[PDB]
Amino acid sequence: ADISLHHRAVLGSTMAYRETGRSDAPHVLFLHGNPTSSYIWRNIMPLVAPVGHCIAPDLIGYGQSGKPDISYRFFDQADYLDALIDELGIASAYLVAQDWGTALAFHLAARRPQLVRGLAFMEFIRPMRDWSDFHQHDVAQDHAEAARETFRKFRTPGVGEAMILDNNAFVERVLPGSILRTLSEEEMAAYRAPFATRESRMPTLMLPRELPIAGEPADVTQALTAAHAALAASTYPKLLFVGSPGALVSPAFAAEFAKTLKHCAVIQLGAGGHYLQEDHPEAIGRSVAGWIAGIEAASAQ
Amino acid sequence: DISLHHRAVLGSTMAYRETGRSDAPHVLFLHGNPTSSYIWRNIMPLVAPVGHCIAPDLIGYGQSGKPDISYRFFDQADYLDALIDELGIASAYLVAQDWGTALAFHLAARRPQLVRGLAFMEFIRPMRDWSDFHQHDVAEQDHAEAARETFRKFRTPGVGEAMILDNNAFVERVLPGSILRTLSEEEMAAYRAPFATRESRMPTLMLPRELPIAGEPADVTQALTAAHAALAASTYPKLLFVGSPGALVSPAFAAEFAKTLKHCAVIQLGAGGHYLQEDHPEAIGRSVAGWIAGIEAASAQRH
Numbered sequence: 237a238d239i240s241l242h243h244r245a246v247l248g249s250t251m252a253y254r255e256t257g258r259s260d261a262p263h264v265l266f267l268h269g270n271p272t273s274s275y276i277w278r279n280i281m282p283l284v285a286p287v288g289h290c291i292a293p294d295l296i297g298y299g300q301s302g303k304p305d306i307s308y309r310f311f312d313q314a315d316y317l318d319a320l321i322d323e324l325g326i327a328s329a330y331l332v333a334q335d336w337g338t339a340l341a342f343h344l345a346a347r348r349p350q351l352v353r354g355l356a357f358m359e360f361i362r363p364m365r366d367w368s369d370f371h372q373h374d375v376a377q378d379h380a381e382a383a384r385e386t387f388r389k390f391r392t393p394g395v396g397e398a399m400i401l402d403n404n405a406f407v408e409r410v411l412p413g414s415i416l417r418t419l420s421e422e423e424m425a426a427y428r429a430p431f432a433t434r435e436s437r438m439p440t441l442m443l444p445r446e447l448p449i450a451g452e453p454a455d456v457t458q459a460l461t462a463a464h465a466a467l468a469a470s471t472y473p474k475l476l477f478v479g480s481p482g483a484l485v486s487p488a489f490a491a492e493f494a495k496t497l498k499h500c501a502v503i504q505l506g507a508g509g510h511y512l513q514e515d516h517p518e519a520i521g522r523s524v525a526g527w528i529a530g531i532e533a534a535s536a537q
Numbered sequence: 538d539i540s541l542h543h544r545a546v547l548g549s550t551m552a553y554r555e556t557g558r559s560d561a562p563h564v565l566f567l568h569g570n571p572t573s574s575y576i577w578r579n580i581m582p583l584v585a586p587v588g589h590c591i592a593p594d595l596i597g598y599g600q601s602g603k604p605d606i607s608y609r610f611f612d613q614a615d616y617l618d619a620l621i622d623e624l625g626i627a628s629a630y631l632v633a634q635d636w637g638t639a640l641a642f643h644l645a646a647r648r649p650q651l652v653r654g655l656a657f658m659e660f661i662r663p664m665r666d667w668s669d670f671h672q673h674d675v676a677e678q679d680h681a682e683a684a685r686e687t688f689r690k691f692r693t694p695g696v697g698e699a700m701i702l703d704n705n706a707f708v709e710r711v712l713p714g715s716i717l718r719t720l721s722e723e724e725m726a727a728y729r730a731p732f733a734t735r736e737s738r739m740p741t742l743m744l745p746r747e748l749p750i751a752g753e754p755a756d757v758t759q760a761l762t763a764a765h766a767a768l769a770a771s772t773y774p775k776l777l778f779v780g781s782p783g784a785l786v787s788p789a790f791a792a793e794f795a796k797t798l799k800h801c802a803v804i805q806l807g808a809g810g811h812y813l814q815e816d817h818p819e820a821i822g823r824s825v826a827g828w829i830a831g832i833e834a835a836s837a838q839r840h
């Protein structure tokens with residue numbers, strides 16, 4: 237019962253979001269990536285409810301949000317998310333993010349440096365100099381190579397169309413292949429539901445093509461480069477969750493990354509895939525809610 | 538890795554468990570009756586990345602010594618004070634349950650500079666009469682009146698001795714009766730081990746007789762009254778964990794109590810008994826570690 241669904245009309249379309257917690261608590265934005273929706277935060281938001289006003293948007297073209305006729309590039313995603321945030325009047329918020337949600341969060345904090353009260357993040361996107369940086373790890377390689385090959389295909393003209401628009405591979409193969417626990421039939425149903433038609437899957441094809449790999453595309457590479465430099469300069473508290481062996485972010489890399497930042501703690505979750513929320517909702521929700529309470533306590537008087 | 542250590546304190550020795558890097562903030566874990574630092578074993582490893590975790594065994598509990606003392610609330614307070622001084626702990630987070638909260642509140646009242654934060658659950662407060670002890674509105678009222686009855690029998694001369702000294706009722710009946718999951722043979726054995734002999738059981742008898750109920754005993758009542766007044770005025774960060782239906786603290790009481798304090802978040806654990814660590818160790822360890830990370834980052838940013 238506790239989580240409600242809402243919609244706001246913005247940029248000539250609608251954005252959906254899930255909402256829980258007291259109206260008067262600090263704002264907490266939960267930002268999903270590809271090809272998920274605010275549904276992926278369903279077991280995490282109730283744990284954070286006692287300390288934050290939890291808002292979990294569905295990105296444009298994802299979940300219950302509209303499907304306008306737009307390019308669905310990273311910058312489109314940023315623009316729709318901004319519009320919703322502004323419509324709701326959110327001027328100050330914690331961010332909790334994963335996948336393309338972290339790219340959105342980093343870019344948001346860069347453009348709006350007074351907004352972020354703290355960032356909780358995991359499995360984050362950064363500029364990758366070469367394909368060896370996509371899913372980089374030291375554990376005795378076969379998985380990492382096969383994810384590289386999937387995304388190489390997603391990024392190939394015609395091939396990517398057939399895999400994603402025709403066969404919905406990002407939702408049907410990549411998503412469950414990246415979570416350890418067995419998803420229920422209703423959980424798969426909820427993930428595939430926005431994506432029933434071929435055309436509706438375009439956003440899920442657009443995002444692996446926006447990944448900043450070998451400088452391509454340059455616009456996203458450059459924006460995420462600016463965003464990472466702002467992240468490194470920022471002073472707000474940060475919580476970085478990491479799984480083993482890590483998809484985009486290994487435990488070793490998390491540790492080294494965290495030293496490049498101010499006030500970042502690393503939380504080792506143990507075994508996981510790319511989408512950590514489905515294997516660790518309780519460890520994530522519990523950590524985040526205590527972290528917010530801490531920051532709010534220490535910040536006030 | 539959690540290691541076990543000893544120090545000579547006052548007229549005896551004290552054990553404590555330790556884990557985490559020696560240059561992180563001190564985090565003290567305080568157990569109650571009739572447990573030991575063993576109860577924190579699945580919680581300390583989750584806080585270890587953010588804190589220097591020390592978990593004492595109270596005098597007469599766990600692996601601590603067994604001096605011929607009265608084992609009153611103040612003897613506990615004195616032996617814990619001395620271990621804290623011996624360890625040179627001047628600043629700490631406190632993580633506490635049952636008589637460990639009494640000790641915590643009493644500690645913080647006397648040394649207000651010490652406390653970086655207090656994470657607490659299922660805590661002792663002066664209770665005006667028995668209906669206060671285990672108050673809830675859930676229709677196992679049977680389980681509540683039973684608990685009251687148990688504790689009234691513990692406080693009765695001759696009867697408490699036969700229940701606890703002769704039969705070891707607190708270890709054998711109250712402890713597992715107050716945890717939702719079934720303890721393994723190994724787990725019971727670790728709760729039994731300090732209380733194998735009849736004379737060892739004395740600490741577990743004295744504490745229910747220390748419980749401040751209808752002003753008795755007057756002295757613990759007065760100390761814990763003072764301690765609750767200082768907790769209500771304190772400004773350090775607080776987490777209060779709460780279980781359903783509640784043993785000493787119901788979710789409804791935790792909500793009213795949080796309104797009395799500054800900077801206290803109430804964390805809902807769901808179904809649990811009086812001893813919350815055995816059913817919710819991941820939720821507690823994760824919450825505490827998160828809270829510490831947040832307080833340390835915001836305090837660093839500030840100063």
Ligand SMILES: [Cl-]
Pocket residue numbers: 267268269270272276334335337511
């Ligand atoms: Cl996601």
Ligand SMILES: [Cl-]
Pocket residue numbers: 270443444445447
């Ligand atoms: Cl992607």
Ligand SMILES: [Cl-]
Pocket residue numbers: 567568569570572576634635637812
């Ligand atoms: Cl305890």
Ligand SMILES: [Cl-]
Pocket residue numbers: 570744745746748
């Ligand atoms: Cl007791």
